[PDB]
Amino acid sequence: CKGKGAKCSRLMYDCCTGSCRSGKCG
């Protein structure tokens, strides 16, 4: 996963916190 605030993609839940937030994990 990525650290909340890490550029993510369309939507593939790759955050360590939750989901994407405006293109940034969160």
Q: Are 3 and 20 in contact (CB under 8 A)?
A: no
- Domain limits of the chain? 1-26
Q: What is the DSSP letter of 17?
A: S
List 20's β-bridge partners, or say none: 25
Residues 19, 11: Cα–Cα separation, whole Å: 8
CA 9 to chain centre: 8
Residues 22, 6: Cα–Cα separation, whole Å: 10
Tell the residue number behind the tokens 């937030």, with chain if given.
21
Residues 5, 24: Cα–Cα separation, whole Å: 4
Pick from 13, 12, 7: nearest CA to 22:
7
Q: Are 25 and 6 in contact (CB under 8 A)?
A: yes
List 21's β-bridge partners, or say none: 24
Q: What's the N-to-C CA distance of the chain in angstroms? A: 11
CA 24 to chain centre: 5
